[PDB]
Amino acid sequence: MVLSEGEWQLVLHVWAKVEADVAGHGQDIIIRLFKSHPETLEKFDRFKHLKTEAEMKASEDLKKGGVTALTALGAILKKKGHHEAELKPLAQSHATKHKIPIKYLEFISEAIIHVLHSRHPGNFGADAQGAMNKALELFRKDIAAKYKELGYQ
Numbered sequence: 761m762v763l764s765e766g767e768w769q770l771v772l773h774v775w776a777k778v779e780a781d782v783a784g785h786g787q788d789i790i791i792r793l794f795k796s797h798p799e800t801l802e803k804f805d806r807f808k809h810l811k812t813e814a815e816m817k818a819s820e821d822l823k824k825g826g827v828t829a830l831t832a833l834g835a836i837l838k839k840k841g842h843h844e845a846e847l848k849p850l851a852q853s854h855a856t857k858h859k860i861p862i863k864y865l866e867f868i869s870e871a872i873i874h875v876l877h878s879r880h881p882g883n884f885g886a887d888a889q890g891a892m893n894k895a896l897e898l899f900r901k902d903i904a905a906k907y908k909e910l911g912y913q
């Protein structure tokens with residue numbers, strides 16, 4: 761699969777709004793992930809004790825981790841598919857150190873789409889959401905191929 765430039769521009773135009781406040785978007789996305797799929801919280805040894813959304817919102821560590829994760833995703837998206845170099849360390853850590861199944865990358869993709877749909881109707885109409893889904897699908901397809909090369913799943 762290959763995105764068109766027009767599709768990449770829809771992706772980047774909503775990402776530009778994420779970047780007004782990546783920390784707040786990261787909190788919403790990670791909290792949505794943990795609420796929709798609580799099993800995913802068990803993968804975060806630093807956070808797995810948190811019991812409520814209030815505790816999650818107050819966690820400086822969770823906020824910082826959301827900034828780190830979304831910034832890495834943003835760098836991937838800005839490569840517009842030419843992301844081999846960026847996927848290498850991310851695939852290795854997520855396959856081998858953190859043990860994140862592809863299914864959980866699907867869950868976080870769903871959380872990203874949900875939060876962008878809620879926060880950014882001006883830049884996340886149907887065409888823009890379709891483009892973001894395509895970009896995240898490409899990300900997951902390429903990282904899954906790397907997982908397999910690395911010996912995981």
Ligand code: HEM
Nearest residue numbers: 800803804805806828829832833850853858860864865868
């Ligand atoms: C868009 C998808 C994702 C991106 C771009 C991303 C990015 C990152 C980055 C950059 C780091 C720090 C460097 C590293 O260890 O690789 C990290 C750490 C981590 N990620 Fe992800 N991640 C994603 C999805 C997930 C998911 C779905 C989970 C679990 C369900 C997860 C679990 C973790 C954990 C446990 C750490 C270590 C956190 C810590 O040290 O406290 N990641 N991630």
